[PDB]
Motif scaffolding. Structure first.
Motif, PDB file in Angstrom:
ATOM      1  N   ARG B  12       0.835  -1.185   0.000  1.00  0.00           N
ATOM      2  CA  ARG B  12       0.000   0.000   0.000  1.00  0.00           C
ATOM      3  C   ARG B  12       0.876   1.243   0.000  1.00  0.00           C
ATOM      4  O   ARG B  12       2.065   1.177   0.329  1.00  0.00           O
ATOM      5  N   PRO B  13       0.328   2.393  -0.372  1.00  0.00           N
ATOM      6  CA  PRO B  13       1.138   3.613  -0.404  1.00  0.00           C
ATOM      7  C   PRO B  13       1.222   4.272   0.963  1.00  0.00           C
ATOM      8  O   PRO B  13       0.333   4.142   1.807  1.00  0.00           O
ATOM      9  N   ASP B  14       2.323   4.995   1.166  1.00  0.00           N
ATOM     10  CA  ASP B  14       2.576   5.727   2.394  1.00  0.00           C
ATOM     11  C   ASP B  14       3.202   7.053   1.989  1.00  0.00           C
ATOM     12  O   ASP B  14       3.928   7.114   0.987  1.00  0.00           O
ATOM     13  N   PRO B  15       2.939   8.129   2.738  1.00  0.00           N
ATOM     14  CA  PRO B  15       3.468   9.438   2.334  1.00  0.00           C
ATOM     15  C   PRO B  15       4.916   9.672   2.714  1.00  0.00           C
ATOM     16  O   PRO B  15       5.558  10.545   2.118  1.00  0.00           O
ATOM     17  N   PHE B  17       7.498   7.696   2.315  1.00  0.00           N
ATOM     18  CA  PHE B  17       8.486   6.984   1.518  1.00  0.00           C
ATOM     19  C   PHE B  17       7.840   6.421   0.259  1.00  0.00           C
ATOM     20  O   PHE B  17       6.630   6.160   0.243  1.00  0.00           O
ATOM     21  N   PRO B  18       8.603   6.229  -0.811  1.00  0.00           N
ATOM     22  CA  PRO B  18       8.050   5.604  -2.013  1.00  0.00           C
ATOM     23  C   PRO B  18       8.105   4.093  -1.901  1.00  0.00           C
ATOM     24  O   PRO B  18       8.500   3.553  -0.857  1.00  0.00           O
ATOM     25  N   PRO B  19       7.719   3.370  -2.955  1.00  0.00           N
ATOM     26  CA  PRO B  19       7.807   1.904  -2.897  1.00  0.00           C
ATOM     27  C   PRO B  19       9.225   1.368  -2.986  1.00  0.00           C
ATOM     28  O   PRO B  19       9.446   0.195  -2.661  1.00  0.00           O
ATOM     29  N   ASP B  83       1.331  -1.924   9.748  1.00  0.00           N
ATOM     30  CA  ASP B  83       0.787  -0.579   9.641  1.00  0.00           C
ATOM     31  C   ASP B  83       1.167   0.110   8.339  1.00  0.00           C
ATOM     32  O   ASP B  83       0.463   1.032   7.914  1.00  0.00           O
ATOM     33  N   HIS B  84       2.253  -0.316   7.695  1.00  0.00           N
ATOM     34  CA  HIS B  84       2.706   0.310   6.461  1.00  0.00           C
ATOM     35  C   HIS B  84       2.140  -0.365   5.217  1.00  0.00           C
ATOM     36  O   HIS B  84       1.743   0.321   4.270  1.00  0.00           O
ATOM     37  N   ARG B 149      20.393   1.653   0.749  1.00  0.00           N
ATOM     38  CA  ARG B 149      21.274   2.683   1.300  1.00  0.00           C
ATOM     39  C   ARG B 149      21.431   2.471   2.805  1.00  0.00           C
ATOM     40  O   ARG B 149      20.826   3.146   3.639  1.00  0.00           O
ATOM     41  N   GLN B 151      24.363   1.467   6.131  1.00  0.00           N
ATOM     42  CA  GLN B 151      25.497   2.153   6.747  1.00  0.00           C
ATOM     43  C   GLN B 151      26.845   1.599   6.292  1.00  0.00           C
ATOM     44  O   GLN B 151      27.709   1.277   7.104  1.00  0.00           O
ATOM     45  N   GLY B 154      27.061   6.307   2.553  1.00  0.00           N
ATOM     46  CA  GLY B 154      25.947   7.140   2.980  1.00  0.00           C
ATOM     47  C   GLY B 154      24.975   7.490   1.872  1.00  0.00           C
ATOM     48  O   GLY B 154      23.782   7.679   2.126  1.00  0.00           O
ATOM     49  N   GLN B 155      25.458   7.575   0.637  1.00  0.00           N
ATOM     50  CA  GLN B 155      24.604   7.931  -0.484  1.00  0.00           C
ATOM     51  C   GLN B 155      23.757   6.735  -0.913  1.00  0.00           C
ATOM     52  O   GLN B 155      23.953   5.602  -0.462  1.00  0.00           O
TER      53      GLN B 155
END
Lengths: 293, 189
Positions: B12-15, B17-19, B83-84, B149, B151, B154-155
Protein backbone atom coordinates in the motif's frame (compact mmCIF):
# COMPACT_ATOMS: atom_id res chain seq x y z
CA UNK A 1 -16.25 42.06 -3.15
CA UNK A 2 -13.06 41.09 -4.91
CA UNK A 3 -10.37 39.10 -3.12
CA UNK A 4 -7.69 40.86 -1.12
CA UNK A 5 -4.50 41.27 -3.12
CA UNK A 6 -2.37 40.67 0.00
CA UNK A 7 -3.13 37.88 2.47
CA UNK A 8 -0.80 36.32 5.01
CA UNK A 9 -1.59 33.97 7.89
CA UNK A 10 0.95 33.36 10.63
CA UNK A 11 1.29 29.73 11.60
CA UNK A 12 -0.06 28.06 14.70
CA UNK A 13 1.23 24.80 16.20
CA UNK A 14 4.82 26.02 16.25
CA UNK A 15 7.30 23.20 16.99
CA UNK A 16 11.02 23.36 17.78
CA UNK A 17 14.08 21.42 16.66
CA UNK A 18 14.07 17.89 18.04
CA UNK A 19 17.20 16.68 19.77
CA UNK A 20 18.41 13.09 19.75
CA UNK A 21 20.22 11.42 22.64
CA UNK A 22 20.89 7.71 23.02
CA UNK A 23 20.73 5.45 26.02
CA UNK A 24 19.59 2.14 27.46
CA UNK A 25 16.02 0.90 27.76
CA UNK A 26 14.72 0.30 31.34
CA UNK A 27 17.00 3.17 32.33
CA UNK A 28 14.18 5.03 30.65
CA UNK A 29 12.62 7.01 33.50
CA UNK A 30 15.97 8.66 34.31
CA UNK A 31 16.44 9.87 30.71
CA UNK A 32 17.84 13.25 31.68
CA UNK A 33 21.65 12.83 31.65
CA UNK A 34 21.86 10.79 28.45
CA UNK A 35 24.67 11.81 26.08
CA UNK A 36 23.86 13.19 22.68
CA UNK A 37 24.19 11.41 19.35
CA UNK A 38 27.07 12.99 17.46
CA UNK A 39 27.50 13.29 13.70
CA UNK A 40 30.79 11.94 12.40
CA UNK A 41 32.51 11.31 9.07
CA UNK A 42 33.45 8.13 7.28
CA UNK A 43 34.77 7.31 3.84
CA UNK A 44 33.57 9.70 -1.43
CA UNK A 45 33.18 11.01 2.13
CA UNK A 46 29.86 10.95 3.97
CA UNK A 47 28.45 11.73 7.42
CA UNK A 48 26.85 9.08 9.61
CA UNK A 49 25.22 9.10 13.03
CA UNK A 50 25.13 5.89 15.05
CA UNK A 51 24.17 4.96 18.57
CA UNK A 52 26.93 4.02 21.00
CA UNK A 53 27.68 0.31 21.04
CA UNK A 54 26.26 -0.17 24.56
CA UNK A 55 22.94 1.61 24.00
CA UNK A 56 19.79 0.54 22.16
CA UNK A 57 17.30 3.37 22.69
CA UNK A 58 16.82 6.61 20.77
CA UNK A 59 15.41 9.61 22.64
CA UNK A 60 13.88 12.46 20.62
CA UNK A 61 12.75 15.56 22.50
CA UNK A 62 10.98 18.69 21.29
CA UNK A 63 8.42 21.24 22.47
CA UNK A 64 5.23 22.63 20.93
CA UNK A 65 3.25 25.84 21.41
CA UNK A 66 -0.43 26.06 20.50
CA UNK A 67 -1.16 29.71 19.83
CA UNK A 68 -4.80 30.10 18.86
CA UNK A 69 -6.76 32.81 17.12
CA UNK A 70 -6.70 31.03 13.77
CA UNK A 71 -8.88 33.37 11.72
CA UNK A 72 -7.21 36.76 11.92
CA UNK A 73 -4.70 37.44 9.12
CA UNK A 74 -1.55 39.45 9.65
CA UNK A 75 -1.83 41.49 6.43
CA UNK A 76 -4.89 42.35 4.36
CA UNK A 77 -5.75 45.14 1.93
CA UNK A 78 -9.54 45.18 2.09
CA UNK A 79 -11.51 45.83 5.27
CA UNK A 80 -14.79 44.34 4.03
CA UNK A 81 -13.14 41.11 2.88
CA UNK A 82 -11.41 40.74 6.25
CA UNK A 83 -14.67 41.25 8.17
CA UNK A 84 -16.46 38.77 5.91
CA UNK A 85 -13.62 36.31 6.53
CA UNK A 86 -13.90 36.73 10.30
CA UNK A 87 -17.67 36.22 10.13
CA UNK A 88 -17.11 33.05 8.10
CA UNK A 89 -14.51 31.58 10.48
CA UNK A 90 -16.52 32.62 13.56
CA UNK A 91 -19.57 31.00 11.94
CA UNK A 92 -17.53 27.80 11.53
CA UNK A 93 -16.35 27.79 15.15
CA UNK A 94 -19.83 28.58 16.47
CA UNK A 95 -21.39 25.80 14.38
CA UNK A 96 -18.82 23.20 15.44
CA UNK A 97 -15.70 23.29 17.57
CA UNK A 98 -12.09 22.40 16.92
CA UNK A 99 -12.70 18.83 18.13
CA UNK A 100 -12.07 17.10 14.79
CA UNK A 101 -8.78 18.82 13.97
CA UNK A 102 -7.51 18.47 17.53
CA UNK A 103 -8.51 14.81 17.46
CA UNK A 104 -6.39 14.19 14.36
CA UNK A 105 -3.53 16.31 15.76
CA UNK A 106 -3.81 14.24 18.94
CA UNK A 107 -3.51 11.08 16.86
CA UNK A 108 -0.39 12.41 15.14
CA UNK A 109 1.16 13.19 18.52
CA UNK A 110 -0.05 9.82 19.81
CA UNK A 111 1.96 7.65 17.42
CA UNK A 112 5.38 8.60 16.11
CA UNK A 113 4.93 10.25 12.71
CA UNK A 114 7.72 12.67 13.69
CA UNK A 115 10.04 9.66 13.87
CA UNK A 116 10.19 9.42 10.09
CA UNK A 117 12.54 6.54 9.28
CA UNK A 118 13.62 5.89 12.88
CA UNK A 119 10.20 4.35 13.56
CA UNK A 120 10.56 1.78 10.75
CA UNK A 121 11.67 -1.52 12.23
CA UNK A 122 11.55 -0.94 15.98
CA UNK A 123 10.64 -3.21 18.88
CA UNK A 124 8.74 -0.72 21.03
CA UNK A 125 8.07 3.01 20.69
CA UNK A 126 6.87 4.97 23.73
CA UNK A 127 5.68 8.59 23.64
CA UNK A 128 5.48 10.78 26.75
CA UNK A 129 3.65 14.12 26.56
CA UNK A 130 3.71 16.76 29.28
CA UNK A 131 1.65 19.90 29.79
CA UNK A 132 3.43 22.89 31.32
CA UNK A 133 1.91 25.89 33.13
CA UNK A 134 4.87 27.11 35.23
CA UNK A 135 8.14 25.52 36.21
CA UNK A 136 6.01 22.41 36.89
CA UNK A 137 4.05 19.65 35.14
CA UNK A 138 0.26 19.92 35.05
CA UNK A 139 -0.74 16.59 33.48
CA UNK A 140 1.38 13.81 31.97
CA UNK A 141 0.36 11.32 29.27
CA UNK A 142 2.16 8.09 28.42
CA UNK A 143 1.18 6.34 25.19
CA UNK A 144 2.21 3.34 23.10
CA UNK A 145 2.87 4.24 19.48
CA UNK A 146 2.79 0.77 17.94
CA UNK A 147 -0.62 -0.16 19.35
CA UNK A 148 -2.06 3.11 18.05
CA UNK A 149 -2.52 2.69 14.32
CA UNK A 150 -0.84 4.57 11.52
CA UNK A 151 -3.93 4.94 9.31
CA UNK A 152 -6.98 4.28 11.52
CA UNK A 153 -8.13 7.21 13.67
CA UNK A 154 -9.84 5.38 16.54
CA UNK A 155 -11.07 7.16 19.64
CA UNK A 156 -9.73 6.78 23.19
CA UNK A 157 -10.29 8.45 26.55
CA UNK A 158 -6.76 9.87 26.86
CA UNK A 159 -6.79 11.08 23.26
CA UNK A 160 -10.09 12.80 23.99
CA UNK A 161 -8.47 14.48 27.01
CA UNK A 162 -5.45 15.69 25.03
CA UNK A 163 -7.74 16.63 22.14
CA UNK A 164 -9.69 18.77 24.61
CA UNK A 165 -6.39 20.37 25.60
CA UNK A 166 -5.35 21.19 22.02
CA UNK A 167 -8.90 22.24 21.09
CA UNK A 168 -8.92 24.48 24.15
CA UNK A 169 -5.62 25.90 22.92
CA UNK A 170 -6.58 26.72 19.34
CA UNK A 171 -9.78 28.48 20.43
CA UNK A 172 -7.80 31.03 22.44
CA UNK A 173 -9.14 29.94 25.84
CA UNK A 174 -5.68 29.55 27.37
CA UNK A 175 -1.97 29.00 26.89
CA UNK A 176 -0.80 25.55 25.78
CA UNK A 177 2.86 24.49 25.88
CA UNK A 178 3.59 20.79 25.44
CA UNK A 179 6.79 18.80 25.91
CA UNK A 180 7.01 15.72 23.68
CA UNK A 181 9.58 12.98 24.33
CA UNK A 182 9.83 9.84 22.18
CA UNK A 183 11.61 6.56 22.91
CA UNK A 184 12.53 3.86 20.40
CA UNK A 185 14.29 0.51 20.68
CA UNK A 186 16.45 0.15 17.58
CA UNK A 187 19.49 -1.92 18.53
CA UNK A 188 23.03 -1.78 19.85
CA UNK A 189 25.11 0.51 17.68
CA UNK A 190 22.54 0.86 14.88
CA UNK A 191 22.03 3.93 12.69
CA UNK A 192 19.83 6.90 13.45
CA UNK A 193 18.49 9.28 10.80
CA UNK A 194 18.79 13.03 11.33
CA UNK A 195 17.73 15.48 8.66
CA UNK A 196 20.05 16.23 5.76
CA UNK A 197 21.42 19.64 4.78
CA UNK A 198 21.89 21.32 1.41
CA UNK A 199 26.14 14.18 2.57
CA UNK A 200 26.05 16.65 5.44
CA UNK A 201 23.71 16.25 8.39
CA UNK A 202 21.91 18.93 10.38
CA UNK A 203 23.19 19.56 13.87
CA UNK A 204 23.05 21.89 16.86
CA UNK A 205 25.88 22.37 19.34
CA UNK A 206 27.41 18.86 19.13
CA UNK A 207 24.16 16.91 18.72
CA UNK A 208 22.28 15.51 15.75
CA UNK A 209 18.86 17.02 15.18
CA UNK A 210 15.79 17.21 12.95
CA UNK A 211 14.48 20.41 11.37
CA UNK A 212 11.40 22.01 12.86
CA UNK A 213 9.43 22.14 9.61
CA UNK A 214 9.77 18.38 9.17
CA UNK A 215 8.13 17.70 12.52
CA UNK A 216 5.63 20.35 11.49
CA UNK A 217 5.08 18.32 8.33
CA UNK A 218 4.51 15.22 10.43
CA UNK A 219 1.90 16.87 12.65
CA UNK A 220 -0.46 18.12 9.92
CA UNK A 221 -1.11 14.84 8.09
CA UNK A 222 -4.88 15.17 8.30
CA UNK A 223 -6.18 14.95 4.77
CA UNK A 224 -8.16 11.74 4.26
CA UNK A 225 -10.47 13.52 1.84
CA UNK A 226 -8.79 13.21 -1.53
CA UNK A 227 -11.04 12.91 -4.59
CA UNK A 228 -8.75 10.28 -6.10
CA UNK A 229 -8.24 7.53 -3.52
CA UNK A 230 -8.91 7.25 0.21
CA UNK A 231 -7.17 3.87 0.36
CA UNK A 232 -3.56 5.04 0.49
CA UNK A 233 -3.67 7.15 3.64
CA UNK A 234 -3.56 10.66 5.08
CA UNK A 235 -0.86 12.83 3.53
CA UNK A 236 -0.28 16.36 4.79
CA UNK A 237 -2.36 19.48 4.23
CA UNK A 238 -1.24 21.73 1.37
CA UNK A 239 -2.96 24.02 -1.10
CA UNK A 240 -2.90 22.07 -4.38
CA UNK A 241 -2.48 19.09 -2.09
CA UNK A 242 0.73 17.52 -3.27
CA UNK A 243 3.35 14.95 -2.35
CA UNK A 244 6.93 15.80 -3.27
CA UNK A 245 8.28 12.25 -2.95
CA UNK A 246 5.55 10.63 -5.05
CA UNK A 247 5.79 13.42 -7.64
CA UNK A 248 1.99 13.63 -7.80
CA UNK A 249 -0.36 16.52 -7.09
CA UNK A 250 -3.71 15.43 -5.71
CA UNK A 251 -6.58 17.92 -5.42
CA UNK A 252 -6.14 19.56 -8.81
CA UNK A 253 -7.43 23.05 -9.63
CA UNK A 254 -9.22 21.54 -12.63
CA UNK A 255 -11.52 20.01 -10.01
CA UNK A 256 -13.38 22.13 -7.46
CA UNK A 257 -11.63 20.90 -4.32
CA UNK A 258 -8.57 23.20 -4.26
CA UNK A 259 -8.09 25.48 -1.25
CA UNK A 260 -8.25 28.67 -3.32
CA UNK A 261 -11.43 27.56 -5.09
CA UNK A 262 -13.21 26.52 -1.88
CA UNK A 263 -12.09 29.66 -0.06
CA UNK A 264 -13.29 31.91 -2.88
CA UNK A 265 -16.59 30.05 -3.17
CA UNK A 266 -17.15 30.08 0.60
CA UNK A 267 -16.13 33.62 1.54
CA UNK A 268 -17.28 35.68 -1.44
CA UNK A 269 -20.37 33.78 -2.60
CA UNK A 270 -21.64 32.08 0.63
CA UNK A 271 -21.60 28.67 -1.09
CA UNK A 272 -20.71 26.48 1.85
CA UNK A 273 -18.96 23.23 0.83
CA UNK A 274 -19.26 19.85 2.53
CA UNK A 275 -18.27 19.63 6.18
CA UNK A 276 -15.02 17.73 5.62
CA UNK A 277 -13.86 20.26 3.03
CA UNK A 278 -14.53 22.93 5.65
CA UNK A 279 -12.19 20.98 7.92
CA UNK A 280 -9.67 21.12 5.07
CA UNK A 281 -9.98 24.91 4.64
CA UNK A 282 -9.68 25.63 8.37
CA UNK A 283 -6.71 23.23 8.46
CA UNK A 284 -5.05 25.40 5.82
CA UNK A 285 -5.74 28.47 7.94
CA UNK A 286 -4.09 26.81 10.95
CA UNK A 287 -1.16 25.97 8.65
CA UNK A 288 -0.80 29.60 7.57
CA UNK A 289 0.91 30.88 4.48
CA UNK A 290 1.19 33.59 1.85
CA UNK A 291 -2.13 33.85 0.05
CA UNK A 292 -3.59 36.38 -2.36
CA UNK A 293 -2.12 37.57 -5.64
CA UNK B 1 5.46 -29.17 -8.55
CA UNK B 2 4.54 -29.90 -4.92
CA UNK B 3 5.03 -26.61 -3.01
CA UNK B 4 1.53 -25.16 -3.37
CA UNK B 5 1.50 -22.83 -0.34
CA UNK B 6 1.77 -19.11 -1.13
CA UNK B 7 2.18 -16.14 1.21
CA UNK B 8 1.46 -12.88 -0.61
CA UNK B 9 2.40 -9.37 0.51
CA UNK B 10 0.41 -6.47 -0.94
CA UNK B 11 2.07 -3.05 -0.93
CA UNK B 12 0.00 0.00 0.00
CA UNK B 13 1.14 3.61 -0.40
CA UNK B 14 2.58 5.73 2.39
CA UNK B 15 3.47 9.44 2.33
CA UNK B 16 6.80 9.14 4.17
CA UNK B 17 8.49 6.98 1.52
CA UNK B 18 8.05 5.60 -2.01
CA UNK B 19 7.81 1.90 -2.90
CA UNK B 20 11.57 1.72 -3.51
CA UNK B 21 12.48 2.46 0.12
CA UNK B 22 9.77 0.05 1.28
CA UNK B 23 11.26 -2.54 -1.07
CA UNK B 24 14.70 -1.89 0.43
CA UNK B 25 13.50 -2.13 4.04
CA UNK B 26 11.41 -5.19 3.19
CA UNK B 27 14.53 -6.56 1.49
CA UNK B 28 16.24 -6.20 4.86
CA UNK B 29 13.22 -7.89 6.45
CA UNK B 30 13.73 -10.77 4.00
CA UNK B 31 17.51 -11.02 4.46
CA UNK B 32 16.98 -11.02 8.24
CA UNK B 33 13.60 -12.80 8.15
CA UNK B 34 14.91 -15.73 6.06
CA UNK B 35 18.67 -15.66 6.68
CA UNK B 36 18.03 -15.00 10.38
CA UNK B 37 14.94 -17.25 10.39
CA UNK B 38 15.66 -20.64 8.87
CA UNK B 39 14.12 -22.80 6.16
CA UNK B 40 15.79 -23.53 2.83
CA UNK B 41 12.61 -24.37 0.88
CA UNK B 42 11.11 -20.88 1.16
CA UNK B 43 11.34 -18.55 -1.84
CA UNK B 44 9.88 -15.23 -2.96
CA UNK B 45 8.48 -14.01 -6.27
CA UNK B 46 8.36 -10.45 -7.63
CA UNK B 47 5.35 -10.12 -9.98
CA UNK B 48 5.84 -6.48 -11.04
CA UNK B 49 9.37 -6.94 -12.40
CA UNK B 50 10.24 -5.16 -15.64
CA UNK B 51 13.74 -4.98 -17.14
CA UNK B 52 12.67 -2.05 -19.35
CA UNK B 53 11.48 0.05 -16.39
CA UNK B 54 14.02 -0.82 -13.65
CA UNK B 55 11.22 -1.78 -11.24
CA UNK B 56 11.29 -4.39 -8.48
CA UNK B 57 7.65 -5.34 -7.90
CA UNK B 58 4.13 -4.10 -7.13
CA UNK B 59 3.04 -7.15 -5.09
CA UNK B 60 5.11 -9.80 -3.32
CA UNK B 61 4.22 -13.44 -3.98
CA UNK B 62 5.83 -15.69 -1.37
CA UNK B 63 6.14 -19.45 -1.87
CA UNK B 64 6.72 -21.74 1.12
CA UNK B 65 5.58 -25.05 2.61
CA UNK B 66 2.44 -25.65 4.69
CA UNK B 67 4.13 -25.01 8.05
CA UNK B 68 6.77 -22.85 6.35
CA UNK B 69 4.02 -20.29 5.65
CA UNK B 70 1.62 -21.25 8.47
CA UNK B 71 4.09 -20.15 11.18
CA UNK B 72 5.26 -16.87 9.60
CA UNK B 73 1.86 -15.14 9.63
CA UNK B 74 1.91 -14.51 13.41
CA UNK B 75 5.42 -13.02 13.31
CA UNK B 76 5.93 -10.22 15.88
CA UNK B 77 9.09 -9.43 13.90
CA UNK B 78 6.73 -8.98 10.92
CA UNK B 79 5.07 -6.09 12.77
CA UNK B 80 5.59 -2.47 11.78
CA UNK B 81 4.91 -3.33 8.15
CA UNK B 82 1.40 -4.32 9.28
CA UNK B 83 0.79 -0.58 9.64
CA UNK B 84 2.71 0.31 6.46
CA UNK B 85 1.61 -2.46 4.06
CA UNK B 86 -1.17 -5.06 3.83
CA UNK B 87 -1.33 -8.83 4.14
CA UNK B 88 -3.49 -11.73 2.96
CA UNK B 89 -4.05 -15.42 3.71
CA UNK B 90 -2.98 -18.85 2.43
CA UNK B 91 -4.37 -20.04 -0.90
CA UNK B 92 -3.85 -23.08 -3.10
CA UNK B 93 -1.80 -23.13 -6.29
CA UNK B 94 -2.88 -24.41 -9.73
CA UNK B 95 -1.65 -27.60 -11.37
CA UNK B 96 0.38 -26.21 -14.33
CA UNK B 97 2.78 -23.64 -12.92
CA UNK B 98 5.24 -21.97 -15.32
CA UNK B 99 8.89 -22.50 -14.38
CA UNK B 100 10.28 -18.97 -13.99
CA UNK B 101 13.65 -17.72 -12.73
CA UNK B 102 14.17 -15.31 -9.82
CA UNK B 103 17.33 -15.22 -7.71
CA UNK B 104 20.30 -13.07 -6.68
CA UNK B 105 23.44 -12.77 -8.81
CA UNK B 106 26.17 -10.18 -8.26
CA UNK B 107 28.01 -8.66 -11.23
CA UNK B 108 31.43 -6.99 -11.19
CA UNK B 109 31.06 -3.70 -13.09
CA UNK B 110 34.03 -1.93 -11.46
CA UNK B 111 37.78 -2.53 -11.97
CA UNK B 112 38.75 -0.18 -9.11
CA UNK B 113 38.33 -2.77 -6.34
CA UNK B 114 40.25 -5.37 -8.35
CA UNK B 115 42.66 -2.51 -9.07
CA UNK B 116 43.03 -2.09 -5.30
CA UNK B 117 43.65 -5.79 -4.69
CA UNK B 118 45.62 -5.80 -7.96
CA UNK B 119 47.64 -2.87 -6.62
CA UNK B 120 48.25 -4.83 -3.40
CA UNK B 121 49.05 -8.12 -5.18
CA UNK B 122 50.17 -7.40 -8.76
CA UNK B 123 52.03 -4.17 -7.87
CA UNK B 124 50.62 -2.11 -10.73
CA UNK B 125 51.52 1.52 -11.41
CA UNK B 126 49.35 4.48 -12.40
CA UNK B 127 49.81 4.03 -16.15
CA UNK B 128 50.63 0.30 -15.96
CA UNK B 129 47.72 -0.60 -13.67
CA UNK B 130 45.50 2.01 -15.35
CA UNK B 131 46.47 0.67 -18.79
CA UNK B 132 46.49 -3.00 -17.77
CA UNK B 133 42.75 -2.66 -17.05
CA UNK B 134 40.82 -1.61 -20.19
CA UNK B 135 37.76 0.62 -20.18
CA UNK B 136 35.52 -2.14 -21.61
CA UNK B 137 35.91 -4.43 -18.56
CA UNK B 138 33.29 -2.45 -16.60
CA UNK B 139 29.56 -2.40 -17.37
CA UNK B 140 26.42 -1.30 -15.52
CA UNK B 141 23.72 -3.96 -15.21
CA UNK B 142 20.30 -2.42 -15.89
CA UNK B 143 18.28 -5.05 -14.02
CA UNK B 144 15.69 -4.29 -11.31
CA UNK B 145 17.82 -2.78 -8.54
CA UNK B 146 16.93 -1.81 -4.97
CA UNK B 147 18.39 1.29 -3.29
CA UNK B 148 19.79 -0.47 -0.22
CA UNK B 149 21.27 2.68 1.30
CA UNK B 150 22.57 1.15 4.52
CA UNK B 151 25.50 2.15 6.75
CA UNK B 152 28.35 1.24 4.39
CA UNK B 153 28.11 4.19 1.99
CA UNK B 154 25.95 7.14 2.98
CA UNK B 155 24.60 7.93 -0.48
CA UNK B 156 21.95 5.95 -2.33
CA UNK B 157 23.17 2.82 -4.11
CA UNK B 158 21.86 0.22 -6.59
CA UNK B 159 20.89 -3.45 -6.39
CA UNK B 160 22.19 -6.43 -8.36
CA UNK B 161 20.23 -9.62 -9.05
CA UNK B 162 20.05 -12.05 -11.99
CA UNK B 163 16.85 -13.81 -13.07
CA UNK B 164 16.36 -16.93 -15.16
CA UNK B 165 14.37 -17.87 -18.26
CA UNK B 166 10.75 -18.95 -18.61
CA UNK B 167 9.63 -22.56 -18.94
CA UNK B 168 6.69 -24.88 -18.35
CA UNK B 169 8.21 -28.02 -16.78
CA UNK B 170 8.78 -28.22 -13.03
CA UNK B 171 12.36 -28.35 -11.68
CA UNK B 172 12.33 -27.68 -7.94
CA UNK B 173 15.36 -27.14 -5.74
CA UNK B 174 16.74 -25.59 -2.59
CA UNK B 175 16.32 -21.85 -2.14
CA UNK B 176 19.18 -19.39 -1.69
CA UNK B 177 19.98 -17.19 1.32
CA UNK B 178 17.39 -14.61 0.18
CA UNK B 179 14.69 -17.02 -1.01
CA UNK B 180 15.68 -17.06 -4.68
CA UNK B 181 16.76 -19.49 -7.40
CA UNK B 182 20.30 -20.90 -7.51
CA UNK B 183 19.76 -24.12 -9.47
CA UNK B 184 16.07 -24.62 -8.75
CA UNK B 185 13.19 -22.91 -10.54
CA UNK B 186 10.10 -21.26 -9.05
CA UNK B 187 6.51 -20.78 -10.27
CA UNK B 188 5.40 -17.43 -11.67
CA UNK B 189 1.73 -16.48 -12.01
Amino acid sequence: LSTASVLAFERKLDPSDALMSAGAWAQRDASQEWPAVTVREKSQTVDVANLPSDADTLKVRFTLRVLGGAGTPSACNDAAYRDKLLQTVATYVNDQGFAELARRYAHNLANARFLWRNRVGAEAVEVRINHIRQGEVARAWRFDALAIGLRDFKADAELDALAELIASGLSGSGHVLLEVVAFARIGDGQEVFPSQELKTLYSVRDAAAIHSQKIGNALRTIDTWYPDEDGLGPIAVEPYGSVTSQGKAYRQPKQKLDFYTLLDNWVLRDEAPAVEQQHYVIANLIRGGVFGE
Amino acid sequence: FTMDHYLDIRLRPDPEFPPAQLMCVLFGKLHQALVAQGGDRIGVSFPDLDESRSRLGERLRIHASADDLRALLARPWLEGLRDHLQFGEPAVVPHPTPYRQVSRVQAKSNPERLRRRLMRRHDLSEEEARKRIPDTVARALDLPFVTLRSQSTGQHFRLFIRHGPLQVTAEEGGFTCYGLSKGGFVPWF
